[PDB]
Amino acid sequence: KKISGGSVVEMQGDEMTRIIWELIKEKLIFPYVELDLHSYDLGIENRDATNDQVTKDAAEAIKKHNVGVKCATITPDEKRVEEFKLKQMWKSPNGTIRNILGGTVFREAIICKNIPRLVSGWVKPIIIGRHAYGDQYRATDFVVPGPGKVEITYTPSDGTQKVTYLVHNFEEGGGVAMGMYNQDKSIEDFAHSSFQMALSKGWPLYLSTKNTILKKYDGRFKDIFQEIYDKQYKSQFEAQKIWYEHRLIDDMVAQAMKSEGGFIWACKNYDGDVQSDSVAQGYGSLGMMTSVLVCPDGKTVEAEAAHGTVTRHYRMYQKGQETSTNPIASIFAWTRGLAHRAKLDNNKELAFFANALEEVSIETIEAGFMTKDLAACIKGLPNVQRSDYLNTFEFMDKLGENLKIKLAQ
Amino acid sequence: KKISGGSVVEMQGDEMTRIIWELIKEKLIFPYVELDLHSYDLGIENRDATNDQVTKDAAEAIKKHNVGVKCATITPDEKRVEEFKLKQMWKSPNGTIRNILGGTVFREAIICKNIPRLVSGWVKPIIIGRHAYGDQYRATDFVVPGPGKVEITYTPSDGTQKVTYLVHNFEEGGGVAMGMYNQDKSIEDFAHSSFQMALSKGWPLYLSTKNTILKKYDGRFKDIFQEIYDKQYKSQFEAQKIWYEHRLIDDMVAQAMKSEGGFIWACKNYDGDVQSDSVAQGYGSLGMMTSVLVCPDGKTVEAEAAHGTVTRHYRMYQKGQETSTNPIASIFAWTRGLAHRAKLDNNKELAFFANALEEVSIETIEAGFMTKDLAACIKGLPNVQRSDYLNTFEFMDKLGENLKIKLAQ
Ligand SMILES: NC(=O)c1ccc[n+]([C@@H]2O[C@H](COP(=O)([O-])OP(=O)(O)OC[C@H]3O[C@@H](n4cnc5c(N)ncnc54)[C@H](OP(=O)(O)O)[C@@H]3O)[C@@H](O)[C@H]2O)c1
Ligand SMILES: NC(=O)c1ccc[n+]([C@@H]2O[C@H](COP(=O)([O-])OP(=O)(O)OC[C@H]3O[C@@H](n4cnc5c(N)ncnc54)[C@H](OP(=O)(O)O)[C@@H]3O)[C@@H](O)[C@H]2O)c1
Ligand SMILES: [Mg+2]
Ligand SMILES: [Mg+2]
């Protein structure tokens, strides 16, 4: 019999992931779960034929039904215009979905006992939440060709005095300057999503800033987090035996390095962008990392794999050659989206399914069945032999059958 | 029989490091090397006595004689002005010496094979250089208390052809905003010290930036490094089988994590401050890290331990309790200073001494004779027993006695 799974927006995507995506639904999901499924094809073909409007449609569909699961999509560049004869160099679907939904993106590992990390001691997930707006990413930067002054000026709407600050007087030669900003409302959303994510996963939360030097800019993030914590989350944190602390970024990267893991780490835009590439690598393959967008509203979530379409593997797949692409990240996109769906609907049976699929995936790996990327974590890439791993399809077949066995009890 | 070691400027310091400093000189340096020493007591009491003049004097002496070796010093805060009745909250001696000399600080680990790192494969040194100036550290930040526009502006010295960059029109509520800059001259210096360090150590060099988004601000860093490489350093790198490449920060932090080590990593101001704490902890104890200032002139160096005065340890020492403070970093401040003295004076015998003391230090530890911090890296802090390590004095006595053995050869 089939579990009543509810409403979910489903976004098909490109290349290697698209093939894996279909295998996941066919073999892992639809056999066990009936869904009020709203599909939008964000394949690059159907994106061009609708002028990116299927993307905006899907973002709004997530806003309406609250749970989005998305396959990796090609982000058009020049090479990709030539490739598909694209009418316009369309923007990142993730950029467009983020911008429409708001929210913070959090990256959580999938951890298996028999797969060594690069940071030996990481035994639990370090979940980085990256504040997705402003700072360096909406900066206004320029070359300073020669002598002159760079000033920054605030002009109040309430009539009162314009303020002008000298940033630097270039007396000889030139250089470089920029302005950047953040927005109180965005910082509050970032805060809300981080507090909520910590309360739902059951881990403490740390915020990193550099407020020792950026006393006003970063002080603001620190103040906003503290004041939201105090008036809206503190007592749930203590009832759950969790805490919230602000840290200096220099202390935090050191603490994360020495940690066992088991915490949420809210990062500023740039720090999240960098520190999450470090942490993912410290865990191992990107095939073991999801990327989940969590809106401030408590309700709306969008889940994907942290990696891309895996073009290189797709090229070999197009040539009739062997592939071993890790599907775990795509699977946990499904399971983590489904678990959130189940939390919204109070659906014990769906929560039970999502968790059992995670367990089947981990157990199957723990038993010796794994893709090449994972075999390389054990032996070192130069020593992997063909008998150490399964191809993509053998691995999915195995997971599909172990799942079936696990679901019978 | 003594080695003529030449001219060295020596700077005494504070607390636990100060005790260790004297021991190093008495037991490891002075029995073997005669020096034209120029001593300066940058202990906290003497800085106060001379209104921080001894710090400026020391820095002018480094300028004159080209090599400096410095013990860890107290940076005054409120609590410290109380402790010593300081007539003013004196500036960090590091930042006073750095501003006077120019130069870029580079951090290099000491690696022993029986001491595990936190990061698996790190087997060779990852030497981060930090651009010492500008960006966040000389920025102009402020709170935006309500609606209004923020604009940053460049006005050429002749007062003509002003360019205004709108950073944000804050329509509802407020936020935060910032102007920052860098300077061509400073960036060139940074490039020269990085290229020189790479060619002296015999490692390749990477420069990390975020030029995918900061196209003008960071492309300037990239362009300047590239034009100084192509004009002045390329043929030397090629003769030494060594390369220079620019990397995106996101790629670099991932590369470093996956690496076996063995490169110089030039970082921008903020990235250097952050990633060097991450890397230091990835290696283990701070007692195994030095911090060497290298001036663009090719000639002038200042060496010290990357750690501080180890105040916690010093308190135990002041109450007549046993202490175990790693002196390796202070020793490598002396050996790396003396090697640079040797390079400048073409002093084979001094060069031999420096390297032998480094070897002795590593071998002693590799043979099981070590301080508590290192025993903690092997066993885990909670599992360390007294018999797993040596106390400070026992450890120095053992080095001094292995050193004497090695010098008979
Ligand atoms: N959210 C998104 O939709 C998203 C995110 C990132 C990138 N992209 C897009 O995806 C495309 C590919 O970009 P990319 O090559 O930079 O990124 P990628 O797809 O993440 O692939 C980079 C490399 O990482 C390894 N890898 C990644 N995912 C893996 C998996 N599931 N299993 C095994 N190995 C995996 C592979 O290493 P080896 O090659 O060494 O095997 C692979 O070639 C681009 O079109 C880009 O725009 C999309
Ligand atoms: N370059 C400099 O001159 C410099 C740099 C940094 C700090 N400081 C000054 O140093 C003082 C102390 O600052 P801090 O306490 O933050 O930093 P610290 O002196 O570096 O001590 C930090 C902690 O790291 C461990 N540690 C550091 N050095 C060690 C060594 N050689 N052997 C074994 N363990 C070591 C100890 O950990 P456990 O306590 O866990 O054992 C120690 O308590 C302050 O006055 C500060 O201003 C100076
Ligand atoms: Mg990134
Ligand atoms: Mg730092």
Q: Does B253 contact A at CB distance below 8 Å?
A: yes
In the numeric block, which tokens belong to residue A191? 């805060």
How far is Cα A43 from Cα A90, in angstroms, rounded to an integer? 12
Contact B270 A217 (CB under 8 A): no
- For residue A72, the CA-to-ligand 3 centroid distance in Å is 16
How far is Cα A187 from Cα B144, in angstroms, rounded to an integer? 13
Q: If phi over 0 gives left and psi between -120 and 50 gives alpha, with beta otherwise, what is residue B140?
A: beta
DSSP state of A157: S
Dihedral of alpha carbons A345, A346, A349, A355, sign: positive
How far is Cα A261 from Cα A200, in angstroms, rounded to an integer? 17
How far is Cα A127 from Cα A104, in angstroms, rounded to an integer? 12
Q: If phi over 0 gives left and psi between -120 and 50 gives alpha, with beta otherwise, what is residue B220?
A: alpha
How far is Cα B298 from Cα B300, in angstroms, rounded to an integer? 6
Ramachandran angles phi, psi of B194, nearest 5°? -70, -45
- Please give the tally of structural domains in chain B: 1
Inter-CA distances, A59 with A54, A63, A101, Å:
9, 6, 7
Task: Assess contact for B177 and A179: CB atoms under 8 A.
Answer: yes
Ramachandran angles phi, psi of A309, nearest 5°? -80, -5
Contact B173 A183 (CB under 8 A): yes
Q: Tokens 């750095």 sit at which residue? A: B98
Q: Which residue range(s) make up the domain with A250?
A: 1-409
Task: Assess contact for A70 and A98: CB atoms under 8 A.
Answer: no
How far is Cα B188 from Cα B76, in angstroms, rounded to an integer? 32
Q: Does A178 contact B at CB distance below 8 Å?
A: yes
End-to-end CA gap in chain B = 15
Helix (H, G, I), strand (E, B) or coil at A242: coil
How far is Cα A20 from Cα A71, in angstroms, rounded to an integer? 9
**Degrees, nearest 5: CA angle B315-B317-B320:** 115
Ramachandran angles phi, psi of B22, nearest 5°? -60, -45
Task: Assess contact for B58 and B69: CB atoms under 8 A.
Answer: no
End-to-end CA gap in chain A = 13
Strand order in the sheet with A67-70: A33-41, A3-12, A67-70, A301-305, A290-294, A104-107, A126-130, A263-267, A205-209, A244-248
Resolution stated for this PDB structure, in Å: 2.4
Q: Give the β-pairing of A104-107 and A126-130.
A: antiparallel
B330 class by beta-carbon count within 10 Å (0-12 exposed, 13-18 middle, 19+ buried): buried
User: Mutate which of B217, B222, B276 to disrupt the A interface (most A C-beta within 10 Å)?
Assistant: B217
In the numeric block, which tokens belong to residue A183? 């927005």
In the numeric block, which tokens belong to residue A208? 């990193």
How far is Cα B367 from Cα B377, in angstroms, rounded to an integer? 15
Contact A257 B216 (CB under 8 A): no
Instruction: Give the burial string for B384-400 (b: 16+ CB within 10 Å, else e).
Output: beeeebbebeebbebbb
H or E element that contains A93:
helix A93-101
Nearest to B332 by CA among B313, B299, B355: B355
Instruction: Write the CB contacts of A373 (distance below 8 Å, at least 6 apart in sequence).
Output: A284, A285, A287, A324, A326
Instruction: Write the CB contacts of A239 (distance below 8 Å, at least 6 apart in sequence).
Output: none
How far is Cα A186 from Cα A81, in angstroms, rounded to an integer? 34
Tell which one of A307, A365, A371 to mutate to probe ligand 1, the residue whose CB is within 8 A of the most ligand atoms: A307
Instruction: Write the CB contacts of A3 (distance below 8 Å, at least 6 apart in sequence).
Output: A32, A33, A34, A347, A349, A350, A353
Instruction: Tell me how crowded residue A382 is: count the other CB atoms within 10 A of its CB.
Output: 6
Task: Assess contact for A105 and A132: CB atoms under 8 A.
Answer: yes
**Degrees, nearest 5: CA angle A291-A292-A298:** 165
Helix (H, G, I), strand (E, B) or coil at A32: coil
Polymer length in residues for chain B:
409
**Degrees, nearest 5: CA angle B33-B37-B40:** 140
For A179, nearest residue in chain B (alpha carbons): B179
Contact list, A184 vs chain B (CB under 8 Å): 173-176
Largest CA-CA distance found in chain A, in angstroms, rounded:
78
Contact A217 B180 (CB under 8 A): no
Task: Assess contact for A129 and A266: CB atoms under 8 A.
Answer: yes
In the numeric block, which tokens belong to residue A122? 């990481």
Using a CB cutoff of 8 Å and minimum separation of 24, what contacts does A239-244 make?
Answer: A240/A199, A240/A202, A242/A198, A242/A199, A242/A202, A242/A203, A242/A204, A242/A205, A243/A204, A243/A205, A244/A195, A244/A198, A244/A204, A244/A205, A244/A206, A244/A207
Task: Assess contact for B21 and B330: CB atoms under 8 A.
Answer: yes
Task: Assess contact for A98 and A132: CB atoms under 8 A.
Answer: yes
How far is Cα B354 from Cα B351, in angstroms, rounded to an integer? 5
Tell me whether residue A211 is annotated as binding. no
Residues 122-141 on B with a CB inside 8 Å of A are 136-141
How far is Cα B134 from Cα A359, in angstroms, rounded to an integer? 50
Instruction: Write the CB contacts of A287 (distance below 8 Å, at least 6 apart in sequence).
Output: A305, A307, A325, A326, A327, A328, A329, A371, A373, A374
Q: Give the β-pairing of B175-183 and B163-170.
A: unpaired
Ramachandran angles phi, psi of A119, nearest 5°? -105, 100
Task: Assess contact for A2 and A32: CB atoms under 8 A.
Answer: yes
B380 class by beta-carbon count within 10 Å (0-12 exposed, 13-18 middle, 19+ buried): exposed
In the numeric block, which tokens belong to residue A295? 């809106």
**Residues in a beta bridge with B153:** A151, B164
How far is Cα A148 from Cα B157, in angstroms, rounded to an integer? 4
Q: Give the β-pairing of A3-12 and A263-267.
A: unpaired
DSSP state of A119: B
How far is Cα A93 from Cα A48, in angstroms, rounded to an integer? 12
Q: Does B286 contact A at CB distance below 8 Å?
A: no
**Number of CB pairs < 8 Å for A and B?**
246
CATH number at A163 reads: 3.40.718.10
Inter-CA distances, B152 with A135, A167, A180, A188, A252, Å:
14, 9, 9, 26, 32
Task: Assess contact for A115 and A377: CB atoms under 8 A.
Answer: yes
Nearest to B41 by CA among B9, B66, B88, B81: B9
In the numeric block, which tokens belong to residue B345? 């004076």
- For residue B198, the CA-to-ligand 1 centroid distance in Å is 32
Instruction: Tell me how crowded residue A59 is: count the other CB atoms within 10 A of its CB.
Output: 22
Contact A167 B181 (CB under 8 A): yes
Three-state secondary structure along chain B?
CCEEEEEEEEEECCHHHHHHHHHHHHHHHCCCEEEEEEEEECCHHHHHHCCCHHHHHHHHHHHHHCEEEECCCCCCCHHHHHHHCCCCCCCCHHHHHHHHHCCEEEEEECCCCCCCCCECCCCCCEEEEECCCCHHHHCEEEEECCCEEEEEEEEECCCCCCEEEEEEEECCCCEEEEEEEEEHHHHHHHHHHHHHHHHHHCCCEEEEECCCCCCCHHHHHHHHHHHHHHHHHHHHHHHCCCCEEEEEHHHHHHHHHHCCCCEEEEECHHHHHHHHHHHHHHHCCHHHEEEEEECCCCCCEEEEECCCCCHHHHHHHHCCCCCCCCCHHHHHHHHHHHHHHHHHHCCHHHHHHHHHHHHHHHHHHHCCCCCHHHHHHHHCHHHCCHHHCCCHHHHHHHHHHHHHHHHCC
Instruction: Write the CB contacts of A353 (distance below 8 Å, at least 6 apart in sequence).
Output: A3, A32, A33, A338, A407
**Residues in a beta bridge with A303:** A69, A292
Helix (H, G, I), strand (E, B) or coil at A103: coil
In the numeric block, which tokens belong to residue B370? 């070590």
